[PDB]
Amino acid sequence: FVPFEGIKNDLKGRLMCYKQDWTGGFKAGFRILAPTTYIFFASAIPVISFGEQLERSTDGVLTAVQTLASTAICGMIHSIIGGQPLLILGVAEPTVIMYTFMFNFAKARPELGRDLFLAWSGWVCVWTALMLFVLAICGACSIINRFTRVAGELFGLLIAMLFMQQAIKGLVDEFRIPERENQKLKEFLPSWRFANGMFALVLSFGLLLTGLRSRKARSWRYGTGWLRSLIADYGVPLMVLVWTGVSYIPAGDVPKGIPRRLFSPNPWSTVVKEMLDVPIVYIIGAFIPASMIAVLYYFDHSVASQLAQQKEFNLRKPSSYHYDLLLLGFLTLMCGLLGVPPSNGVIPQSPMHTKSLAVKEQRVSNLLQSTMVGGCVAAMPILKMIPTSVLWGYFAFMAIESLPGNQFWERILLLFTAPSRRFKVLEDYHATFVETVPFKTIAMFTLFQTTYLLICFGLTWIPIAGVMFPLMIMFLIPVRQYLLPRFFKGAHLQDLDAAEYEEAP
Amino acid sequence: FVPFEGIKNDLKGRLMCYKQDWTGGFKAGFRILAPTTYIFFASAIPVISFGEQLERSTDGVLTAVQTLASTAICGMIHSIIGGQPLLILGVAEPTVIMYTFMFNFAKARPELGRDLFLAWSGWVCVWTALMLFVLAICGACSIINRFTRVAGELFGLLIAMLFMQQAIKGLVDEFRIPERENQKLKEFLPSWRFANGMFALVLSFGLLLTGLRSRKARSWRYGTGWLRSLIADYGVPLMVLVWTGVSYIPAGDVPKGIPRRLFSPNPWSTVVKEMLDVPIVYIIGAFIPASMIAVLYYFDHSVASQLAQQKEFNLRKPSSYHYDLLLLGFLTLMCGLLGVPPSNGVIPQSPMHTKSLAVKEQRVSNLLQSTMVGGCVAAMPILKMIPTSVLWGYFAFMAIESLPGNQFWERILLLFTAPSRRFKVLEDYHATFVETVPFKTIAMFTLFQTTYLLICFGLTWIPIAGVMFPLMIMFLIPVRQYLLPRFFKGAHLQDLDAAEYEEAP
């Protein structure tokens, strides 16, 4: 834990291959475009969805433009001067939730109001940058091995529940009048509103089901190999385009806002000044949410890097955890100054990128994908054709796609499985702890984990205290270290909380 | 082919067990209700759907009331005095198509008009009864072994295509104004019409997907055994009820006819006289459609009986093909006199009934199920709560459910399968001809069968000549006998057109 030792080691290790990182990427030629576009499509659409969420939750202060710009700039900077280019940066849901809490707090306080929300966010980002600098200097990344499976799967499931909640919220609001829209327009009559709601339901469910089916196209029997691969890789964008076109079918026989489309404005049509006007008391109070955003980033960046640098990939280059965290602090400071939400490592974008590069490790794919994500801002008129129902369907799609490889979800299903029926579980691929651990212990572990998850999810509903859930997430580390061994017996915990995904036939 | 020999033999064989047929049913006790209700639910809903189809195609002359009454009465009469009680009688789609053609013909001719449509149908039914009497007396049922697989699967696929066409027609018409409804009502405004259309889409697709998923509930892992069996048996009615309730959710915030519901009237709120007023020329011309209805019935009754009396069931009682055909002629005459469409054997209602009775062969289950089908007429107000979108979804459901066990559909899929990909077909359960027959011969056979099917389907679109498709169906017998052996080599035809469903692991 010697200060500056880790950063120096990572810089030394990554400074002997920089020219190699660039040359190998240039040597790959035009063949490097396929992974680049794959990751770009995996990254942009969730960013646009988070931007629409922020727009509906921030009264239009933040939109898809800000999220796209932040993602793009942070990605280019990380690719050029970052330590681990395989890591993919972008705006994530927890950041959206934090900013929603901060906006709700600011709106209710006249001293700040909606006008100083971005300035208060910038001060929060300054504080977060300071804490990340401290954590990176003190070598707190040397203990990332304690972010065991339990916390990772609990956080993943919580994010999935938030995604589903947002999808349901959007589908419900499709039946209502927007808060900041003219109420006299024809499209907002009760009949047209009901029609828009049902059309949104149709489009969202179609998108969801078609994408889920397409995710397993390479396993299909029909079609050519290249077509099957193209589908399995780009079903989400392809289905988005298809259902947009479907939405455009009755365009001639209905009003203009039927179905509703992206509310994000077209930009074609710095806040350091206001950060000086914020009262000192609120500048100090920004310490609170900054600590929790810093905790979230310290967790997510490290976990995403660990996933992207799995030993099975046979990577021949070292890791840059500490320098990556320091650069994340710098990026957070810069984004707060610019008036955009900060970006951090995302999952499974980084492992998917590494798999697509399987390894051809270089800094060109990330740079290019961030460049096109930023250029999508210039294509805002085209993106504005996408209905919001498709975005809600995509939210539900991610919520459902967070489940497959999650052991907590499988253990919940086992808990809800009938006693006379577990042979069916044993008839297919299953985890080792099913055989090597008694069912009662698995049930107790799953019940404790589910209670913790539901407590965190309920806390998220509290107006002000709901900004504390990262603290609960981080409390799982010492709990797993100290308390669980008291109530559990060694190998049971090791199998139920193994750092490796163990499967049996 | 000695006249009256077959009928005498069947009557003799079935007259030594009649008292046994009744006593065994009475001895079963209340346990006989489960198969009874299962078959009643399998029979009623398609009958209601066909009634709605006739209502929309007959300008309200025929509705679900007539179809239900015909099904009920014919079923009770067959159970009491029929030869094969396991056979289930009801109104089928080909009868609906024939009556639609006859109504379209009558409407365009002023001498008949809509007022004499039922009288002309009664004369057609009299002719059909005479032809069925002739066929049963001449022993034409001694050659039912020539109704090979090719014709059966072609007819099944044609009926499936008709079902899907009707479902699409209904879903499209949900977006429009009914022909015989007040156009000034609020529910028929463009906005409300669009809303009703999209709600219909939602309900129909939900019903379809949920029913398809529920059909394999016994294979699920979740839930109790009794619950899984109940779902796998009654998913269709359960899903109908669920989606009706869903349709009732926004009832308070929308107009009265949103969503649209059954147009069949509530009866609570004989045509021999008019058959004398029909011109003699049309009485003679009724010979034409009568012959084809007779051909359809001679095919379907015999095939359904053969399926319900499969040797695997180990039935200890003889068959009554000829007497069954004679009784069908009598029932057709009676129904034509009463002014209702005739009923005939249906598939897979009879095999499903036999399976549910697996065999406890008796006349009580059919009698009871027909009695409750008839009593459903008294429950017309309750049935009128069901939206039409659910019925269109059920149409699509039957269309899709006609495919699984059909070898023609599998061979079409194989034809559209990629050459480098047939190992995937070989990786699962498959038919024997896949291994024992070259692919080129299978492709030629499938192409010929598909061309024949498409020709029949296109003929069905002709206004007047579309009533000739049963003749094409019957032409497959002599074709298979004489022409195919010229172009095919023995064992190839035997495997591709085997009377037994041969499967390989």
Swiss-Prot record, chains A, B:
Chief location of this protein? Answer: membrane
Check the record and name the InterPro entries matching this protein: HCO3_transpt-like_TM_dom (IPR011531), HCO3_transpt_euk (IPR003020)
Please indicate the ranges of residues that lie on the Cytoplasmic side. Answer: 1-31, 93-116, 173-191, 251-278
- MF terms (GO), sorted A to Z: active borate transmembrane transporter activity; solute:inorganic anion antiporter activity
Transmembrane segments in this chain: where? 32-52, 72-92, 117-137, 152-172, 192-212, 230-250, 279-299, 327-347, 380-400, 457-477
Per UniProt, which keywords does this protein have?
Anion exchange, Cell membrane, Endosome, Ion transport, Membrane, Transmembrane, Transmembrane helix, Transport, Vacuole
Report the record's Gene Ontology biological process terms.
Answer: borate transmembrane transport; cellular response to boron-containing substance levels; monoatomic anion transport; response to boron-containing substance
Topological domains on the Extracellular side lie at 53-71, 138-151, 213-229, 300-326, 401-456
A Pfam family it matches: HCO3_cotransp
Q: Can you say where in the cell this protein is located?
A: Cell membrane; Endosome membrane; Vacuole membrane
Q: Which GO terms describe its cellular component?
A: endosome membrane; plasma membrane; vacuolar membrane
Q: In which tissues is it expressed?
A: Expressed in proximal side of various root cells, notably in the columella, lateral root cap, epidermis and endodermis in tip and elongation zones of the root. Also detected in the epidermis, cortex, endodermis, and stele cells of the root hair zone. Observed in cotyledons and hypocotyls.
Keyword presence, Transmembrane helix: yes
Domain of life of the native organism: Eukaryota
Q: How does it sit in the membrane?
A: Multi-pass membrane protein
Q: What does this protein do?
A: Efflux-type boron (B) transporter for xylem loading, responsive of boron translocation from roots to shoots under boron limitation. Boron is essential for maintaining the integrity of plants cell walls.
The record's listing under PANTHER family reads: ANION EXCHANGE PROTEIN, BORON TRANSPORTER 1
Q: Which family does it belong to?
A: Belongs to the anion exchanger (TC 2.A.31.3) family.
Protein name per the record: Boron transporter 1
**Organism annotation:** Arabidopsis thaliana (Mouse-ear cress)
* Gene from which the chain derives: BOR1
